[PDB]
Amino acid sequence: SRLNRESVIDAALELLNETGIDGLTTRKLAQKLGIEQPTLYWHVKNKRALLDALAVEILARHHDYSLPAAGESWQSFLRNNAMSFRRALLRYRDGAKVALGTRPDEKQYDTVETQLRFMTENGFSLRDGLYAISAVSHFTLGAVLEQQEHTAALTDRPENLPPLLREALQIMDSDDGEQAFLHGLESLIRGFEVQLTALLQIV
Template sequence: MSKGFSSVWTREGRSAKSTPGLSREQIVRAALELLDAEGTDGLSMRKLGAKLGAGATSIYWYVANKDELLELAYDEIWGEMVIADAEEVSWRYSAASFGKSMRQTILRHPWASQLIGRIPAIGPNALRATDRLRHAVTVAGFEGLEIDYAISTLTAYIFGMTIPETAFNEYLTKEEPDQEAMRAAVVKAVADYPEMAKRITTVYDADPVEIREMSFDFGLYTVLDGLEARLVT
C-alpha cells in the first residue's frame, strides 16, 4: 500500500488566534537555531517547545509533525540563496551565482544536506529561487525538457560536491583528528604513486578552505561550459 503524500505547503494554514504570542516565524527561527547547533537528530517538538517556552501543543497548531517542521526550516534557508537576475546579467553569471550561493548556504546549515531528496523543495522561497534559475536556463536557449535536464545537471554537481564537504567538516568538528598524523598516513598510502604523492604535498601546503572553493568553482564553470556547448551543437 502506497503512503499518501502530505506537505505543510499543500494544506490550508492555520491562524495564530489561539496561540497568542507565538507565530510560525518564531517557531521556524527557533527550529533553525536548534538545527544549526544539533542537527536533525537534535530537533524535537519537546526541545523546540522548551526553547520557545511553550508546550508542544502550541507548535502542533502550525505543523503536524517533525517532517513539516523540517520543511519550513528547509524553505527558510532557500530564502538565503542569491541568484542574479538573468535579465540584468548573463545566464552563466546568474546560474553561477545560484551554484555558489547554494553551496555556501548548505555549508552554513549542514543539516540541510540530509534533507536533499527527502524533503520536497516546494515552499515559496525554494520555488522563487528555482523559477529564477529556470529563467536563466531558458534565456540561455534551452527548451522543453532540456530546461529540466540542465537544472538537474547543475544541482547534481552542487550537491555532489557540497554534501561530502559538509560530512568532512562535521567529522573534523566532532572527531578533531590529528592533522599531522592524517597527513602522514595519506603520504604513506600514496608512496608508490609519485604523481599522487607530489599533489598531496602541494594540497597540504595550501589553505584547505581556499582549495575546496577553487575546486568547486572549477567544476561549476566546467559544467556551465558543457551546458553552453550543447547549445551550439
Template sequence: MSLQSVQEPRSESPLSRERIVATAVELLDAQGLDGLTMRRLADRLGSGVMSLYWHVDNKEDVFDLALDSVLEYRGPPQIVASQDWRGEVVHMLEDWRASMLRHPWSASLLPRRALGPNILSRLELLSKTLSRAGVADADLNVAIWSLWNYVMGATITRANFDLSDDGGAATQQRLARLSERYPRIERSRLLLDNDWDGAFRKGLGFLLDGLAPRQ
C-alpha cells in the first residue's frame, strides 16, 4: 500500500488509517523509533495486530505515514501576495525544523525513508519560491540540498545535544584552563551559548545571502 490515498476494504473494526497514524505518532513521541512495534500499536488502539493490516501494509508503511503526517506544511497564518521571498523561505524552514523538534524521531527517520506527499510539497514550494527569487535552474538543486542539509544538521544537533547548565559550566571551566590551546572557543563561550533559535535564523540568513541573485 502506497502513501497515496486508496479505497480501504470494509471492516467491522473501528480502526482507520488516520487513527492508526495518529496513534503511531503518539507512540513514537513517547518511546522513539525502537518503541514502535505493531503489537504495541495494536495494544494502544485496543485492537488485534491483524486488524491493522486492513489499513497499512506493515511497520515500514506506518513509519512512512507517521513521518509524512508530522511534516505537513500549512503555510504562514495569513497568505498574502508578497515579494519577500526570504521571509517565505525562513518561515518554511523554521516550521520544518520546529515540526521535527516536536517529534525528534523524525529527524533521524527522514533521510532513510521514501519521501511522502507532505515533504515533497514542501520541497516543491521551496523550489518555486527560490525560482521566483531568481535562483537559476542550474543552481536550484544545490540551493535546495544546501538548505535541506542545514535544516537537518541544525535539527539533529539540537535534538541530541544534551548538555545541562552545570555540564556546560564545567566544560567551560575546563576550557578556561586550556585557553592557550583553544583561545577562540574559550573566549566565545561556545558551550554556554544556548540560543538555538537565534543561531538557526542567523545561520539561515548567511545561507540566503549566498543564494540571493547577484545584481
C-alpha cells in the first residue's frame, strides 16, 4: 500500500495497537504494509527511527492541550496539559513506552519553547520550570505505564492477603488509575506552588 510518512506511521500505530511494542518489528510492519523488507528499509531504517516518529505522531494526533489558554494560570495549564498527555499515551497500546526517553522533535520546538517561556513568565527560573514540567511528565508516564503494563500482565496470567493490602488492591481494581492519577497530580502541582511562592524563605 502507500508508503509516505503518514501511511507508514498509520500502519505502525495500528500494528503497535495490536501486538504492542514487542511486536513492532520491521518484518511485521512490512507484512502489514504488504511489502518486502528491502522496500520498507528504504523508508524506515530501524526500529529506533520508527519509535521516535511514533512518539511524535501520538501527541500530534491526540495531545490536544499542548498550549496554555489566554490568561490561564500555570497551575491550570499543567493540570490540563497532564490530563491531555495522559489521554494521548493511553490511546495506543504501550504508547507510554513508545514516548519514553525521547527529546523534543524539530516539529515540537515551538510548542515546548512556548511551554518553557510560559513557566518563566509565571515566576519560575528556567531550571525550576523545567523541573516542574519534567516531574509532571514523569509522574504521568509512570502512572500510564503501570496502568497499561498491569493490563498486559492480567491477560498473560492470573487469598493469603493481609487486610490493608487486600483492600488497597480492591481500591486499585475498582478504577482504571484515573482517580489516583488526578489525586497525585494535585499534590504535585501544589508542591510546586509552595516551592515557587517560598522564594528565599526556608520552607
